[PDB]
Point group: C3
Chain length 335, copies 3
């Protein structure tokens, strides 16, 4: 019985970080409380100055990652401020009933609601907005993120041995549908409502103009690259709420991967490239053995290098000649 | 030896139902006899009045589901009436040899043939027409369905424990390629042969105009919604003979799923969204715990809500506040 | 320590064959030496005379398959002759560090380099060229192939029982992006550099003009069909370095399949159609039980029959009436 359990309040953090949490816990079930606020905002998504009339949870794409343990209850307060123009709600793939909660969280601008559900299944699960008659537009404009429900005794390999991570990162991949004018340049709209009709026409072609990690081309590069060090194990959470993708770490692997994202199933090992189905989140563990700059990308290489689906991980530490060695550097062909 | 076994005759039923059958059986192997008749027919596929020059098994899209047990023999009589214009045949992915049977069932209008094959592998398998030189057109125009071969001792979980369903439903998803004229409206053709050339041109773009469950937009809604009740376990069979899809139950899950559709492999549990490869059938079990109207859809949300890949399940019974509760209804933001 | 182990030199062979090798071996770890030479060349890819300005490893699409055992070291010499125009390198998905080796193998025309890496993970893995700023163009123009790393004690089923193959075949599937002129005919270019700008524009549509096995439409048909015989077990290696595909054997199955391509994971059995993610190689075993001409294809049937993704296997031996029998040949409908 839920209203008799202890409550705890969690403060969310912006992607690509994930808020502090315990993996294996001796703690009993809790009601874990969160809040999120919708923000409609225009956003620059590429190096040409192209804009998207965007819709976000807490101001970011993706929304923040929420983390609980199997058997906890999630209690979310969803706020839709009067500065917004549209109605919104939330569907948790991790929940059971009432269209994932969407039927109980319909909030017009100026309103809020509170939902509770039991997180009775372990894994990474998508959440997204789903207002009647406007579902795909709200999703592709930026309203999605991940709930992670960890098993109470932590992650396990196929033989039941313990697995861990030292840091977690969250990557949301967004297929965007930006309209063009008769001059062949991308259109810039004064309001969110004015972008609607033209955007639906692009969507129906099923061809994205851009595909970006965390809100823009190059979001996870330069000063904003992911980081790690040799010997450290990282969890990479990858959500795609609308379209399939195929993650790959250049110079690495997926040591243990749940591509369907559900921790009660055995992971697979040694993957070069894995597959996240549109409408889900998956998770990969990797332990760095070499330093350097890695690329993490969608391995449809057109989607990655032409359309935007790629980022960087900068890894410090000591080079290992046993794993790889330059025997002869590039030099003229002997004759 | 097959011609020495008992024969039984089965009467097929129209989708989305599946004909009565036993799951676990003590019965020994049988020769199980079926008949199907091809019908070429023009069909309205959307709410605008758009038509498809269609080709069907028994008058429906998909064709009916055929159910036998591992070790039975399937003996099908295929009839091509003289009212049809084209030659046809059948390829069972469940069979071994002769292009799945296609080489032995080539029937011109006015003809019939009878094929027998051993159903020696368990799972859900696609069948489809495949006439030399015209294969993709006949498949995308509607000629596909599912053969289910159940293990003799019923379905099993990864630990070998028994699994069951109380009702089965069959959903065929069809990517359609309808041509347009210079005014930008869909074309209506007087005959099947006249649609051919224009349709090939659309197909080569790889962009469907429509994607529909069971023959039309909204086929599985209103009076024709699927039904169930709290406590009941349903099997959802999903076939796609030409193109990938990603099934999802809104407010539910896949309790146990064989996404590749082959029952001798362990299922996965707790899936949010699964993946049916073009050219296959997969199967999901779910036990309802909450009443209400669920949506069952392809979670490329453009494909579902714009192009047609979505239906409804109406579930009766008692609401469960432990799984989900509205703590505070939508109301003004406190100030 | 690698520079203290025995060295062996291997001679590569052209696809669809794979060079002779042992499956299970009592041999200890070796440094296994290979060489490959890049060849830029114009190539006819269809029956209309269409050309591709191509880039290849050893003159073929795909590149040759390299085979070692888990714990061996791969030592490759990569040569870029002065007759070529562009810089090249190599990224092995099977390797750890330095962008899979790409950072250590940058060779301008007239140069060569030698790389060594430990093949410490079993499976089939893609290798491909990846020059800074030009990655997708070099990959889709033909620069990819497969490294197979076999477990030291051979392939195993989910229960640890031994599995074998009698012959191996390697199939590379290539999505091509050929530009058209204002008359709607495919363009023919005098040099590789002149095709670049127009080709990028086609790539960004994400719609291939052609999809071919081993370099052209019908590559693996007629005199160049694959072969086998009843009772023989074949391994079919399928690589796709840029785009998803869904292999199917018409009249057969995947007896045991590693669709993600990594041999330390249990295979699945009885598959009708499997899935190779863009940016990977997978492997299927099948034992022929019936003679005849099989088709092996991508089961997006438009991609196979309209765009080129299909080949043939000719199988000799004795027909088996227990598995399949024509009960009644095509004949007039009785009245
Ligand atoms: Cu919304
Ligand atoms: Cu959803
Ligand atoms: Cu037909
Ligand atoms: Cu087929
Ligand atoms: Cu290159
Ligand atoms: Cu790669
Ligand atoms: Zn309480
Ligand atoms: Zn509280
Ligand atoms: Zn907890
Ligand atoms: Zn819409
Ligand atoms: Zn650690
Ligand atoms: Zn980069
Ligand atoms: Zn008989
Ligand atoms: Zn009989
Ligand atoms: Zn039976
Ligand atoms: Zn055709
Ligand atoms: Zn039941
Ligand atoms: Zn609906
Ligand atoms: Zn040495
Ligand atoms: Zn040597
Ligand atoms: Zn070896
Ligand atoms: Zn490029
Ligand atoms: Zn053998
Ligand atoms: Zn053929």
């Amino acid at each position: 019985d839920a209203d008799k359990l202890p409550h705890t309040k969690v403060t969310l953090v912006a992607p690509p970080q994930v808020h502090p949490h315990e993996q294996a816990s001796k703690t009993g079930p809790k009601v874990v409380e969160f809040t999120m606020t919708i923000e409609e905002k225009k956003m620059v998504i590429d190096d040409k100055g192209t804009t998207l009339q965007a819709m976000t949870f807490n101001g970011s794409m993706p929304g923040p990652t929420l983390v609980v343990h199997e058997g906890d209850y999630v209690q979310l307060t969803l706020v839709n401020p009067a500065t917004n123009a549209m109605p919104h709600n939330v569907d948790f793939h991790g929940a059971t009933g009432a269209l994932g909660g969407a039927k109980l969280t319909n909030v017009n601008p100026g309103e809020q609601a509170t939902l509770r559900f039991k997180a009775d299944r372990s894994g990474t699960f998508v959440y997204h907005c789903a207002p009647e008659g406007m579902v795909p537009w709200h999703v592709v404009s930026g309203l999605s993120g991940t709930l992670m429900v960890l098993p109470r005794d932590g992650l396990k390999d196929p033989e039941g041995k313990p697995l861990h991570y030292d840091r977690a990162y969250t990557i949301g991949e967004f297929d965007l549908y930006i309209p063009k004018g008769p001059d062949g340049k991308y259109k810039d709209y004064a309001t969110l409502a004015e972008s609607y009709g033209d955007t639906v026409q692009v969507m129906r072609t099923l061809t994205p103009s851009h595909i970006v990690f965390n809100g823009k081309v190059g979001a996870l590069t330069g000063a904003n690259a992911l980081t790690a060090k040799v010997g450290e194990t990282v969890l990479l959470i990858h959500s795609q709420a609308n379209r399939d993708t195929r993650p790959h770490l250049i110079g690495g692997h997926g040591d243990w991967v749940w591509e369907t994202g559900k921790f009660a199933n055995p992971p697979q090992r040694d993957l070069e490239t894995w597959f996240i189905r549109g409408g889900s989140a998956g998770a990969a563990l990797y332990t760095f053995k070499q330093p350097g700059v890695y690329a993490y990308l969608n391995h449809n290489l057109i989607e990655a290098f032409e359309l935007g689906a790629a980022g960087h991980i900068k890894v410090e530490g000591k080079w290992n000649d046993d794993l790889m060695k330059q025997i002869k550097a590039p030099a003229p062909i002997p004759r």
